[PDB]
Design a protein around this ligand. Sequence first.
Ligand SMILES: CCCCCC/C=C/CCCCCCCCCC(=O)O[C@H](COC(=O)CCCCCCCCCCCCCCC)COP(=O)(O)OC[C@@H](O)CO
Ligand SMILES: Nc1ncnc2c1ncn2[C@@H]1O[C@H](COP(=O)(O)OP(=O)(O)O)[C@@H](O)[C@H]1O
Ligand SMILES: Nc1ncnc2c1ncn2[C@@H]1O[C@H](COP(=O)(O)OP(=O)(O)O)[C@@H](O)[C@H]1O
Ligand SMILES: OC[C@H]1O[C@H](O[C@H]2[C@H](O)[C@@H](O)[C@@H](O)O[C@@H]2CO)[C@H](O)[C@@H](O)[C@@H]1O
Ligand code: VO4
Ligand code: VO4
Ligand SMILES: [Mg+2]
Ligand SMILES: [Mg+2]
Lengths: 374, 371, 358, 490, 288
Amino acid sequence: KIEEGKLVIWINGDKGYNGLAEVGKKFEKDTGIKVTVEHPDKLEEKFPQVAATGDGPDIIFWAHDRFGGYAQSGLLAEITPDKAFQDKLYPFTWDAVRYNGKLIAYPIAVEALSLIYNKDLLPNPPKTWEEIPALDKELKAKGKSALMFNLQEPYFTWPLIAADGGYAFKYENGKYDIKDVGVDNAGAKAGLTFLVDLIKNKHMNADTDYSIAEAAFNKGETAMTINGPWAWSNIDTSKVNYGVTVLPTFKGQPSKPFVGVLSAGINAASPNKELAKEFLENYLLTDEGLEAVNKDKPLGAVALKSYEEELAKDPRIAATMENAQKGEIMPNIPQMSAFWYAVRTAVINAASGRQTVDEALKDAQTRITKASAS
Amino acid sequence: ASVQLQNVTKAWGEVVVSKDINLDIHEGEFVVFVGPSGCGKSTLLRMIAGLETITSGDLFIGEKRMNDTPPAERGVGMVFQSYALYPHLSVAENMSFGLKLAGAKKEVINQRVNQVAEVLQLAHLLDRKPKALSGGQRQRVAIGRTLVAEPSVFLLDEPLSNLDAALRVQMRIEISRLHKRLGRTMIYVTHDQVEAMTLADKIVVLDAGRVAQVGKPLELYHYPADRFVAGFIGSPKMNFLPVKVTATAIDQVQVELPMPNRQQVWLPVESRDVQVGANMSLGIRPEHLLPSDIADVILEGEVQVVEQLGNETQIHIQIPSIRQNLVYRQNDVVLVEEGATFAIGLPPERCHLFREDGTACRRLHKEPGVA
Amino acid sequence: ASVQLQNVTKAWGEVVVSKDINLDIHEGEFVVFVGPSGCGKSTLLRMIAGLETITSGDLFIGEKRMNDTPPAERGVGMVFQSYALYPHLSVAENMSFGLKLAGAKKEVINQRVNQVAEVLQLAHLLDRKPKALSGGQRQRVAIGRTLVAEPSVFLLDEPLSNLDAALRVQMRIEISRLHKRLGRTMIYVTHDQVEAMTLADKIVVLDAGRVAQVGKPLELYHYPADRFVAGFIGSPKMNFLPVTATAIDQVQVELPMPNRQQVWLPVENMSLGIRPEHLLPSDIADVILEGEVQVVEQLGNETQIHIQIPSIRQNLVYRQNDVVLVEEGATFAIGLPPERCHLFREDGTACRRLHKEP
Amino acid sequence: WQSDALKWSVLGLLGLLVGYLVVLMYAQGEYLFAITTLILSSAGLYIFANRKAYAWRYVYPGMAGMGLFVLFPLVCTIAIAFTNYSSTNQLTFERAQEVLLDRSWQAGKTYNFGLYPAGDEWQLALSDGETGKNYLSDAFKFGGEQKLQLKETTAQPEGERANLRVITQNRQALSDITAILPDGNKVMMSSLRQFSGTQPLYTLDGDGTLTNNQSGVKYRPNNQIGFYQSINWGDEKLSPGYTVTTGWKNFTRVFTDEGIQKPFLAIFVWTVVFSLITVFLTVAVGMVLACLVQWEALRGKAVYRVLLILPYAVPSFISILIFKGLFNQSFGEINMMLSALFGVKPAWFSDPTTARTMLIIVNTWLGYPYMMILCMGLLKAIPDDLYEASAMDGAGPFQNFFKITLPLLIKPLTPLMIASFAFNFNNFVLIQLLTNGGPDRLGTTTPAGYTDLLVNYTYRIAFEGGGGQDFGLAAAIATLIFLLVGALAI
Amino acid sequence: QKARLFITHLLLLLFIAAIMFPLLMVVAISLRQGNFATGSLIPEQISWDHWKLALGFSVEQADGRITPPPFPVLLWLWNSVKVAGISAIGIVALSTTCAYAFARMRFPGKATLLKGMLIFQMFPAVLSLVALYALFDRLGEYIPFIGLNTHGGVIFAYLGGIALHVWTIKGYFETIDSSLEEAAALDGATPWQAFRLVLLPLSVPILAVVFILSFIAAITEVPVASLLLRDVNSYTLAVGMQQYLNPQNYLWGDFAAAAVMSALPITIVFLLAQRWLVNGLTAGGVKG
Ligand SMILES: CCCCCC/C=C/CCCCCCCCCC(=O)O[C@H](COC(=O)CCCCCCCCCCCCCCC)COP(=O)(O)OC[C@@H](O)CO
Ligand SMILES: Nc1ncnc2c1ncn2[C@@H]1O[C@H](COP(=O)(O)OP(=O)(O)O)[C@@H](O)[C@H]1O
Ligand SMILES: Nc1ncnc2c1ncn2[C@@H]1O[C@H](COP(=O)(O)OP(=O)(O)O)[C@@H](O)[C@H]1O
Ligand SMILES: OC[C@H]1O[C@H](O[C@H]2[C@H](O)[C@@H](O)[C@@H](O)O[C@@H]2CO)[C@H](O)[C@@H](O)[C@@H]1O
Ligand code: VO4
Ligand code: VO4
Ligand SMILES: [Mg+2]
Ligand SMILES: [Mg+2]
C-alpha cells in the first residue's frame, strides 16, 4: 500500500535530485502535498520487485528502454496528456514512451553520442568517416592521432554500422517487428568493413576501450573522440579546448546513434495518479521546473521544445539534440537483450581477425533471430 | 566411598582390553593396581572416572550404579598419567581451579593451596605456567590439583614415575599421611614395587584384561597363586627351573633337579593334583638363594653377568641343563669376575612349585609376616 | 661421536639454570645424568641436542664446535621425556621416520623396524596410532624411533620411567647390547638408581644447574665429594648426625646423644654420615646405638626400620635382609661401624675416606 | 546464586511473548509465518525445558538462524522453479486483475473545471472548449457521492476561483461528484484540472470473466499459460500476465532443448578445471605465506602479514576492472612490461588458453588471503615439539612442510577446500567483469564463450537471450547445477 | 646458512610488489583529477578533491563556486564498522557454541546435520533476495528493530552464514587434547564451564580467524545491505559507494577513495587480532 497524500519519487543518483526536490518544495507550497525524492542504488531493479506487491514510489525516473518491460509487467499507469500538452515536446520522444501504442511515461531529457574534437589540433572537424584515414596520416607526423573511441562496446560502434542501413529491429509504425532484424544486410556489412579497415591501416586499435580512449583525448593525444554528455566534465577539468559537433556521415548518410530518453512513469498501484500528473505536467515540465534540475546537475538536451531552445545556445547541447534526431530510438522490447551480446561479439570477432565482417554479422543475426523467435 | 566392579568388560571393537573384572574396594581402603605395561590399569581408572564407557557389566560407587553418570557427578578425582594440566593457567591457578568453581572464599583457597604446594616443594613455582616446568614438576602439580580437591575416591595413575628416588620417598609418606587423615578410598597405579609394598592395604595384579590375584602385599610375595604373579611381584624376577616329580606326600612334593646328577629334594608344598613323573616349574627368589658354605642343595655354574649396585651385588649364573640364567643377590660389594666359577645353596622351604597349566602348589611353610 | 662441553652456562633472562659446567665424554662412553627433579638434566640434554640455545660456553661433538649448528645437522637422536610422538602417523611410521628422511631404503627400513619393534615388544602394535596406545607403549615407540635411526650420539631422557619392573630389566639389557655392538656415545637421564649403577661408564650428579660430582658408579657410592652427593646416591637416603680431637690420619668426634660417646674415624660442628645398609646388628659391633621404632616397612626381600634416637630429631633408617617381625613403639639397637662412616664439614665438603673398599 | 524459580519465570515470560505474537500473526493474513514461528519457538522452549535436551541448547541458536536465512531462501528458489514467475508473469492473479480493473478509456467529452465558493457552500463550473459553451451548477455541499445538474450560463460565478490547494484538499469529495450536462452526459473528475467522460475499460462479471466495454470482446483466465485470453480460446492475450504453476516445464526446457546443450560439456569441463586449479593454487600460496610469516627468524613478518591480505581488504569489484585494464593486449602495463623485458605480447583476451590463464591469475590474487588467514589460525594448532622431534630425526624446512605441516592441515582444510570448490564453481561475477566469457565459441546457436562458466552461460539464457527475465528458468537451473555439484561431492 | 632468510626476504619483496601493484593503481585513481580508470602510477595531474569530499571537506572549483560534499562517506564507514563489528561478534558466538556441541557432545543425526549444513549453504544464492525482502518486510511490523531500513535487520541477516565457520572451529576444537576438559569435568566443571574456562582460551587463534573472515565479509557486502537499507544516513560504505556507479560512466575517483577507505577497518581489526594468533597454547599440558 503506497501512502496517499504525498509523492515519493525515485531518480538515479547522477541526476539533479536536489533540484527535483526544490521543484517538489514549490509543489508542496501550492498543494500541501509533501514530495520526497529518493535515489536508491539499483532502483531499476528494486522497482519491479516493490511495485509488483503494490508498493514503491509514485513516480519513477529512468531511461525509456526499461519502461517497456515495466509496462508489460503491469507496473506503469497509462498516462493521458491532451493534444495541447503533447505539442510542447518533440514528437519523436513520444514514440519512445509507447507500449502497445499507448503512452506510459513523460519524456524529460534526451541523450545521444556526439563527435568531440580538439580545437587546438583540429580547427575544422570532418563531415565524413572517409576523411579520417587521410587526416590520421598528417596527425601521425606530429605524434598525435585522429580518432580514438570505445571499440569494445557496440553502443559506441553502432552509429557507423547503422549509417548505410543497419538496424536492430524494423520499427514500422509503432509496432516493433521482432522477426525483422537488420544486422546482416549490406548496410551493416559496409559499416563494419570500414571500421575494420581503420584498424587494418593502423588508424585505430582493435582493443581500444572506454578508459584508453577517454584518457587519450583528455591528455591531448588524439584529435577526436566519440562520447556522450556524461564525459564533458572530465574534459572541463582537463582544460582541453574542445568542441562537440554532429557525428561524421558515412557514404552520404548520417551516423545513427542510439537515443536514450529519460522518462517519468507513474506507478500503476499509486493512489496519487492525479497528484503525480499535476506535478509532472504543470510543475516539472516547464522552463522553471527543468531549470531547477539542470542547475543542480545538467540534463543535456531536454524534451521540452521551449527550454531546449534556450539550452541549444550552448553548441554542445545543440549537437546532442541533432545527433539524437538523426539517430535511432532504443527499442523498449525484451528482445534487445539478445541483440547486445550478439552484436558486441560480432565486432570483437571482426576487429581481432577471428572472423570476417560477413560471417561475424551473419552469425550475429542468426543468434538474434533464433533467440527472438524462441 | 566404596567402589565395586562386577563383571566389567571393555572392548575396542573385537579387541577386548578388559575381561570379566570383579573387584570389591571397601571404604577407606588403599588399593594398588600393578601389572605389565598395556594390561589395562588406566582403562580401569578411566571407566571408574567415567572417561571411558563400559561395554558390559556394572560399576558401583557408594552402592549406586554409576555406568551412565557423567564424570562430574561421580565424586572421583584423578591424577592423570599424562598430567593433563591446564596449560593456559599457572600452577596456583591449576591447583585452585576446582575450588573456584564452587563458591569458595579467596582466603580459603589460598590457605589450602599454599599448604599443599609447600609439602610438594612447589612454593617457588606458584606463578609458573606448565610450559615453564620440568616433567617432575608438572607431575607434582597434577597431584597437587587432586589433593586440594579432596574427592571421595582418589585415583592416581603412576603419580611418582618421573621423580628422583629421594623425593619419591618424601611424596610416598605425604600420600600415606593423607590417607590416614581422611580415611578415604585411594586407587593407586604404580610400577614401583617399593611403593606398592609400603602403601597398599591390598594389591591387585592384572594380566591382559584379567585380574590375576588380589591380596595383601606380603601375601602376594610369599604366596603367589600362579607362575605369572610369582614372576611379577619382587624385582629382580624369580628364577624358574624345570623339574620332575619323583614322589608325593600329602604335605610335601619331591622333585628332581634337571642337572646330569639328577639331585632329589623335598619341598613343603601341597601335592593336590600333582602326579609322579609330571613336569613342574620350580621357583626361587634371588634374595632367598643361600651361600654354598653350608647347604644341602648345591647349584654350581659359570658367571655370565655381575651387577655392582653398591649396597648389594647381583650375579647371573649359567648352570648346565637349564637354558635360563640364575640370578642371585649378595649383600655388600663382592668381587666376582665374569667367567668365574660360582656356587649357591638352594633352600627347600623357600621354593615355589607350579603346575604345567601355571597354577601354584600352595606353599605349606608358614612364613612370618602373613596373618 | 665424542661430546664435550666447555664452561657452558645457560640463563632464562637473568636466572642461571646451568652454571659453568664442564664435561668430557669420549666416544663409545655411556654417561648417565642424575639429580633432583628440576635440576637441569633435560635442559643440559636439550642444549646438546640443539633444541635450546647456549648462552655462553663451547659445545663440541666429534672434535668440532656445534653451538651455531642446527639440531638436524648435529648427527644426534633423542628419546624425549614427553615422547613427542607424531599423532598422524602409526607406530611403524613413527619409528621409520628418521630413515625415511636420510635415504629411504624399502627393505632396510621394514627389516630394522621389525627387529627393533620385536625387542621393545611392540610387534602387535605396528598399525596403531599413538592415541590408541598406553603410556608405556608410547614410551617404547619413542625409544624405537631413536634406535631405528642409529645416530652418532644417543640422548635418552628418562626412557623407562613408565615401564613395569620386569620390562625395565629387559630394556636395560637391550640398551647395553646396542651400546656394545654399535660402540656409540650415549647420554642417559634416569631416576632409577639401578639403571644408573648398571649402565654407566661414568655418572654425572647435577645440583640446581651446576655439576656436583663426576665419577664411577661405585666411586660415587663409596666416596662422595660432599653432603648433597651422599644424600642423593643410594636410596634410602644416607643417615646424618650432627657431630673434639684430631690426629694426623684420623678424626675423632662426639655423638650428640645423652651418653656422649667418642669414636675415631679413618678420614682426612661436623656431620657424620652412615648408610642404612652399612649399619650392623646390636650384639656384634662395639658402638651400640639404641632408640624407639617409629616406622616399619616390609618389602618382602628385606625390612626397613625407622628408629628415633633420644636427643636426635632426625630419624634413623636401618636395612636388614629378609622378613623381620618388629612393631612400632618397640625398642631397637643397632651397631655403628667406624670405618664405614662418612664425615662432612660445616660448609658441606666431605673429608676423604681412606678405608679402601672392594 | 540465581534462583530455580527464576528459570521457570523467564521460560514462562518468553513463553508468553510466544502466543502474544503467534495469535497476533494469526489475526491478520500471515498463517505461513504464524505456523513457522510456532514450531521454531516450541522447539526452543522444549530444548531449554528438560535437561536431557542439553546438547541442543548449543546447536539451536545457530540452526535457527541458518534455517531462517539459508534454508528458507533455498526452499523458495526451488518453489519458484515449478512456476512461470518472470518479467512477463510477475504479478499474482489478484494483482493482475486489480491492474486490469484500474485501466480506463476516454469515452466522452473533456471539460476544464473550476471551483467557486458560494457563501459557506460551493459551485462547480465546466468549460467546453470545442463549442465555447460554459456550464455552472447550483450551490452544493461537500461529502460523499452526489449528482449535480449543470445549467448553461453566460454569467460568471460570484465567488473567486479556488486555489489548487483548495481543490487538492477537497479532492476526494470532488472525485465522488457526477456532473450532468443539459444534453444528458455524465462527467466525472479525471484530473485536478479537468472533468471528463472517463470510464473503466473492463468490468468484472462475477464468474471470473472480464468483458471490454470499448471493443465488446470477452476474456477469461487461462491458468495454463498465465494470461487473460479472449474467448474456445482466441488469438488475443492480455497483459499483465500472472504467476502460475507449470510443473516440470522449466526443468524439461533444459533437457528437451538441443542447442542449449551443444556447448554444455565443454563449458562444464572448464568450470571444474577453473575451480580445481583455483582451490589448489589459493591453498598452496596461502599456506606457504602463512608458514613463512609465522617464522620467528623472519624479522619483518608483522609488516608482510598486513600487506599480504590487502587484496582481500579492498572490495574486489574495482580490482577486477583494474586487472581488465592491466591485461589489455595493446595497452595496459603488463604487456608493455613483457614487451620491454621479453619480446612477447600474450593475447590475454583473444586467445582462449591465455585468457583462461589470466582468469586463474586474477582469481588466485583474489583468493589467496582467504586461505592464508585460515592457515594463520590453523597452524597454531600444531605443537612445537613435533618440530623438535623432526629436528632430532634429521628434518629440514622442506621435509617439515611435506611430512608434518601439510598432512596436519589438509584434514581441517578439506571441508573448506570443498566449499571453495563450490563457490568458485558458481563464480559468475569474475567472468562477467573480466572476460564476458570471451573469446567467443564459434557456431554456438545460444551464445557461449571459452572462459564462460556454467553459471555465466546459463543466466545468459534466463535473463538475457531476449525473452525478458525468466526467474522460473533460472531457479530450475540453479536447482539442477546444485544437484550436479552435490553429485560431484562424492 | 642464513642465505635462506635473504632469499625469502627477496622473494617476499618481489611478491609484495607484484600483488601491491593493482592496489596502488586504485590509490592512483583516488588521487587523479577527474574520473579516469587509467593513467600513470604517479598521476600527471594530482587532485585532493576526491579525498576532500570523502573526508567531508568542501571543494572550491575552477569557476569559483563551492561544492559541498554530496555524501556522508565517513558516517557510511562508521555504519560499516558497526554492522561488521556486531555481525562478527554474533557469528563468532553462534558458530563457537554450535561447534562445541559438534566436537564434544553426542546427539542423533550429528553427522547428517554437519554435512547438511555444508551442502545447503553451497546452494546458489540467485533468487534469495526475493525471499529475504519478503521475510524482513513481514518481520518489520512485529519487531521494528530488525525490519527493513535498520542496522539490526542487516546484522540479523548475516547471522545465518555460519555453516563453514562451525566446521572451521569444530576442526580446531578436535586438535586440542580431550583430557584437559576431562580434568575440568572431574574438578566439577559443567559442560559450559569446561567450554568457557578451558577450551576457549586455547581456541583463541581460530576465534580470531572467524572474527576476521566475518568482519571482511560484512564490510565488503553489497546486495543484501543494499536491499534492506533505504536511508542515505544509514547506508554502509559498500552500499553508499554504489552511488558512484551509473549505466554509462563511473565516478572512479570517488569510488576509489571509498574502496581504499573500506580497507582501513579491515587492516585495524587484522592488526588487533594478532594478539590472539599465538603459538604453543597447549604446550606443557599433556604428556605424549
Ligand atoms: C605453487 C606454489 C606457489 C608458492 C609461491 C608463494 C610465493 C612466496 C615466495 C616464497 C618462496 C618459498 C621459499 C622457501 C624457502 C624456505 C624458507 C625457510 O627456510 O623458512 C622455513 C619456513 O617454512 C616453510 O614454509 C618452508 C617452505 C615450504 C615449501 C613448500 C613449497 C611447495 C609449494 C607447493 C605445495 C603446496 C601444497 C599443496 C596444497 C594442496 C622455516 O621452517 P622450519 O624452521 O623448518 O619450521 C619450524 C617452525 O617454523 C614451524 O612451526
Ligand atoms: N583407543 C584405543 N583403541 C584400541 N586400543 C586401545 C585404545 N586405548 C588403549 N588401548 C589398548 O588397551 C590396553 C590398555 O591400555 P592402558 O589401560 O592405558 O594400559 P596400562 O595397563 O598401561 O594402563 C593397551 O594395550 C592399549 O594398547
Ligand atoms: N621457561 C622457563 N623459564 C624459567 N625456568 C624454567 C623454564 N623452563 C624450565 N625452567 C626451570 O628449569 C629447571 C630445569 O629444567 P629441566 O631441565 O626440565 O629439569 P630436569 O632436571 O628435571 O630435567 C626447572 O627447575 C624448571 O622449573
Ligand atoms: O577462491 C577465489 C575467491 O576467493 C574469495 O572468496 C571467498 C569468500 O570471500 C569467502 O567469504 C568464502 O565464501 O570463500 C570464498 C572462496 O571459497 C574472494 O572473495 C573471491 O573474489 C574469489 O573469487
Ligand atoms: O625432568 V625432572 O623434573 O622429572 O627430573
Ligand atoms: O603402559 V602403562 O603400564 O600405563 O605405563
Ligand atoms: Mg596406564
Ligand atoms: Mg627432565
